[PDB]
Every structure is written in structure tokens, then in C-alpha cells.
Amino acid sequence: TEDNASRLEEFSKEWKDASDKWNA
Amino acid sequence: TEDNASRLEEFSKEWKDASDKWNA
């Protein structure tokens, strides 16, 4: 569970970067 | 674990919105 949570906390940065890129 | 699951259930809506936007 904690490993999966760490994976998602890592992936959220990538998703935020993608959303910021696509907002422009 | 339950807080992380709630976070992912919230984020899935945003990902679905992004996929729907990019399908057009």
C-alpha cells in the first residue's frame, strides 16, 4: 500500500506537468 | 490507504476530462 502511494505521489507530478503544458 | 484511494478517485475524474477533451 505504501509503495503504491509513493508511486502515485511520483506520478502526480508528471500529470501536473502534463496539465500545465496542455493549459497553454 | 483510504485517503490515497479517495485522492485517486478524485484524480480519475480529471484524467477522464482530459481524455475526453483530447479525443476531439
UniProtKB/Swiss-Prot annotation, chains A, B:
Q: Where in the cell is it found?
A: Virion; Host cytoplasm
Residues spanning the membrane:
none
Quaternary context: Interacts with host LamB.
Briefly, what is this protein's role? Attaches the virion to the host receptor LamB, inducing viral DNA ejection. During tail assembly, initiates distal tail tip assembly by interacting with gpI, gpL and gpK. During virus entry to host cell, binds strongly to host LamB in an irreversible attachment. The binding induces structural changes in the tail leading to viral DNA injection through LamB trimeric pore.
Q: Give the family this protein belongs to, as stated in its UniProt record.
A: Belongs to the Caudoviricetes tip attachment protein J family.
* Protein name per UniProt: Tip attachment protein J
The major lineage groups are:
Viruses, Duplodnaviria, Heunggongvirae, Uroviricota, Caudoviricetes
The protein's gene is named J
